[PDB]
């Protein structure tokens, strides 16, 4: 008898086109883990590199002879529908800059299982796996996990707090840029995400760094490896390289109300005589407070509604209005010189991550992320849809009970009151808004320095203008 890989229903993929090599590689890696433990009681010589080889190789052979049954997470019909979508629509990513590659991973928000993926436009013509092995910076999609998610979560801010987007410079003396802008004064957390302004993200991380929040603790809990957290542009996705698979897993976390389940493609390995060599252990972990996570899903639902940096919701509506009705949330990213684009989507029941780019690191059109990648993802989204009607779901994302609402002046994210404006102390009034907070006591009173970030010059022109009462 010979070894085999099966779809999650039970259908045999192949015996022992990305489909084959992904499930086989993850298969071998769990095999390696088990061999290294299966006695050969190792640790640390596991670090020596001559061994690694020996085992990796030994691993491969155990699958070739050995005769085991490998159970994947893959839902055949969706996976096929996905391959078809890329065959039928990959071409909408092409934008006068040569074949554009693509990597997507569709992940259950609750198991962490991967129901299917897109490896690239065409395994025959080119084999790198853009869903699994390639790594690029996630850009402005880092913002929600590494800056805002965290700070809200340490109650250092809430839903309508306020960030300086006034001009300001890295420590080298160069201007923090957004596309072509030097900045624009103050704005809500809402605006800053809907447009992905860079400066607000820059001030957020900086403040985290001054309270020394254990940022790394958080990122590490989702599976991220970032070699150096002391980079000023970190939050914008500077110094971070990731895979679609892995980062899809980051959006899975915000989506499953702050609870990370570890990504995977393999659920079970079973030996000839039925003995279980590997089985997926469900260990959940609570990376963000349900307060924080649900707050975030609210804001990330306007990121798509707003349509400011993605045409998606329009594209999807046009190809299928019912579905465009599911409670979608998401975020985009663009890297320097338009070299990559990212779009992450979740409804509460699934996540879809999608990266488009060139293999050799050159540039896409300006539109590629905002338009192309959006319309393509909307077609992929239908395609899964058609293949498995119930899959995406109808549930709403919802603000958790533990969230805490506050009345605050639109003008300063903060509860109204007296403040010190250079002699002449001030009664601070204007219209209010409810602002969500993931701490026990809600918003502060207004303070001269209400916003995250801002210079002295800044606050002066800001409070100046707030003064027309
Ligand atoms: C977010 O990704 C931010 N982009 C950038 O800061 C930089 N690129 O600008 C052309 C960048 C970030 S990391 C890196 N290596 N380069 C804004 N993101 C979007 C978006 O798609 O949401 C934009 C509309 C353009 S800039």
The closest residue, in CA terms, to atom 20 on ligand 1 is 333
**What's the rounded Cα separation, in Å, for the pair 168 and 454?**
9
**Would the CB of 193 count as within 6 Å of ligand 1?**
no
**Would the CB of 200 count as within 6 Å of ligand 1?**
no
Distances from the Cα of 330 to the Cα of 97, 240, 309, 368, 408, angstroms: 26, 19, 11, 17, 26
Alpha carbon of residue 88 to chain centroid: 26
CA count, 13 A, side-chain hemisphere, 295: 33
446: which 2 tokens?
A: 């207004």
| Sheet with 68-72: strands ordered across | 12-15, 4-6, 68-72, 266-271, 276-279
Distances from the Cα of 460 to the Cα of 198, 207, 291, angstroms: 22, 21, 34
Question: What kind and span of H or E run contains 52?
Answer: helix 49-64
- Which residues is 341 bridged to in the sheet? 334, 356
CB 399 within 8 A of CB 436: yes
- Which residues is 408 bridged to in the sheet? 433
Residue 44 C-alpha to ligand 1 middle, in angstroms? 40
Q: What CATH number belongs to 75-264+281-402? A: 3.40.710.10
Q: Which fold has domain 1-74+265-280?
A: Penicillin-binding protein 2a (Domain 2) (3.90.1310)
Angle CA 331–335–338, to nearest 5: 110
Map tokens 């078809």 to a residue.
84
**What's the rounded Cα separation, in Å, for the pair 264 and 249?**
10
- Which residues is 268 bridged to in the sheet? 71, 279
**What's the rounded Cα separation, in Å, for the pair 332 and 177?**
17
Helix, strand, coil percentages in the chain from 3-state DSSP, rounded to 5: 40, 20, 40
Give which of 194, 190, 189 is closest to 157, Cα–Cα. 189
Distances from the Cα of 110 to the Cα of 163, 255, 350, 458, angstroms: 33, 9, 8, 44
Q: Which fold has domain 403-469?
A: Rossmann fold (3.40.50)
**Would the CB of 368 count as within 6 Å of ligand 1?**
no
How far apart are the two ends of the chain, measured CA to CA in Å? 82
Q: Give the number of the atom of ligand 1 that is nearest the alpha carbon of residue 342.
A: 21
**Would the CB of 336 count as within 6 Å of ligand 1?**
yes
Map out the domains of the chain as residue ranges: 1-74+265-280, 75-264+281-402, 403-469
Alpha carbon of residue 61 to chain centroid: 36
Give which of 347, 314, 315 is closest to 328, Cα–Cα. 347
Residue 153 CB neighbour total at 10 angstroms: 22
Give me the DSSP letters along 118-185. Answer: E--S-TTT----TTTT--B--GGGSIIIIIIIHHHHTTS-BTT-EEE-S--B-TTSPBP-BTTB---S
Ligand-binding site membership of 191 (annotated): no
**Would the CB of 138 count as within 6 Å of ligand 1?**
no
Phi, psi (5° rounding) for residue 173? 95, -15
The closest residue, in CA terms, to atom 3 on ligand 1 is 140
**Would the CB of 332 count as within 6 Å of ligand 1?**
yes
Give me the DSSP letters along 352-387. Answer: EEEEEE-TT--PPPTTIIIIIHHHHHHHHHHHHHHH
Residue 342 C-alpha to ligand 1 middle, in angstroms? 10
**What's the rounded Cα separation, in Å, for the pair 298 and 328?**
10
Ligand-binding site membership of 225 (annotated): yes
Question: What kind and span of H or E run contains 455?
Answer: none
Alpha carbon of residue 325 to chain centroid: 21
Give which of 59, 56, 444 is closest to 278, Cα–Cα. 59
């Amino acid at each position: 008898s010979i070894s085999e890989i099966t779809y999650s229903d039970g259908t045999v993929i192949a015996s022992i086109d990305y489909l084959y090599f992904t499930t086989l590689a993850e298969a071998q890696e769990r095999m390696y883990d088990y061999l290294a433990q299966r006695d050969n009681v190792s640790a640390k010589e596991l670090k020596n590199e001559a061994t690694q080889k020996f085992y990796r190789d030994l691993a491969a052979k155990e699958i070739e002879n050995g005769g085991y049954k490998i159970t994947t997470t893959i839902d055949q019909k969706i996976h096929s529908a996905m391959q078809s979508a890329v065959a039928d629509y990959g071409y909408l990513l092409d934008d006068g800059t040569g074949r554009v590659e693509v990597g997507n991973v569709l992940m259950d928000n609750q198991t962490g299982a991967i129901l299917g993926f897109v490896g690239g436009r065409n395994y025959q013509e080119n084999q790198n796996n853009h869903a699994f092995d390639t790594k690029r910076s996630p850009a402005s999609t880092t913002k929600p996990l590494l800056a805002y998610g965290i700070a809200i979560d340490q109650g250092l801010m809430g839903s309508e707090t306020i960030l300086s987007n006034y001009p300001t410079n890295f420590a080298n003396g160069n201007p923090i840029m957004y596309a072509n802008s030097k900045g624009t004064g103050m704005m809500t957390l809402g605006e800053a995400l809907n447009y992905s302004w860079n400066i607000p993200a820059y001030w957020t991380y900086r403040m985290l760094r001054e309270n020394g929040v254990d940022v790394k603790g958080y990122m590490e809990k989702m599976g991220y490896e970032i070699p150096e957290y002391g980079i000023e542009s970190l939050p914008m996705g500077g110094g971070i390289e990731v895979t679609v698979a892995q980062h899809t897993n980051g959006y899975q976390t915000l989506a499953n109300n702050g609870v990370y389940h570890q990504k995977h493609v393999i659920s079970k390995i079973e030996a000839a005589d039925g003995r279980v060599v590997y089985e997926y252990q469900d260990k959940p972990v609570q990376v963000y407070s349900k307060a924080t996570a649900t707050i975030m899903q609210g804001l990330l639902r306007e990121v798509l509604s707003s349509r400011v940096t993605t045409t998606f919701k329009s594209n999807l509506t046009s190809l299928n209005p019912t579905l465009a009705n599911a409670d979608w949330i998401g975020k985009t990213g663009t890297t320097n010189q338009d070299e990559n684009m990212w779009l992450m989507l979740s409804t509460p029941r699934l996540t879809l991550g999608g990266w488009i780019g060139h293999d050799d690191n050159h540039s896409l059109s300006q539109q590629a992320g905002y338009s192309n990648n959006s319309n393509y993802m909307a077609h992929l989204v239908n395609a899964i849809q058609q293949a498995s009607p119930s899959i995406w779901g109808n549930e709403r994302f919802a603000l958790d009970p533990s969230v805490v609402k506050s009345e605050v002046l639109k003008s300063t994210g903060q509860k109204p009151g007296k403040v010190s404006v250079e002699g002449k102390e001030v009664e601070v009034t204007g219209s209010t808004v409810t602002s969500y907070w993931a701490n026990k006591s809600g918003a502060p009173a207004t303070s001269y320095r209400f916003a995250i970030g801002g210079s002295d010059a800044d606050y002066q022109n800001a409070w100046s203008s707030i003064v027309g009462s």
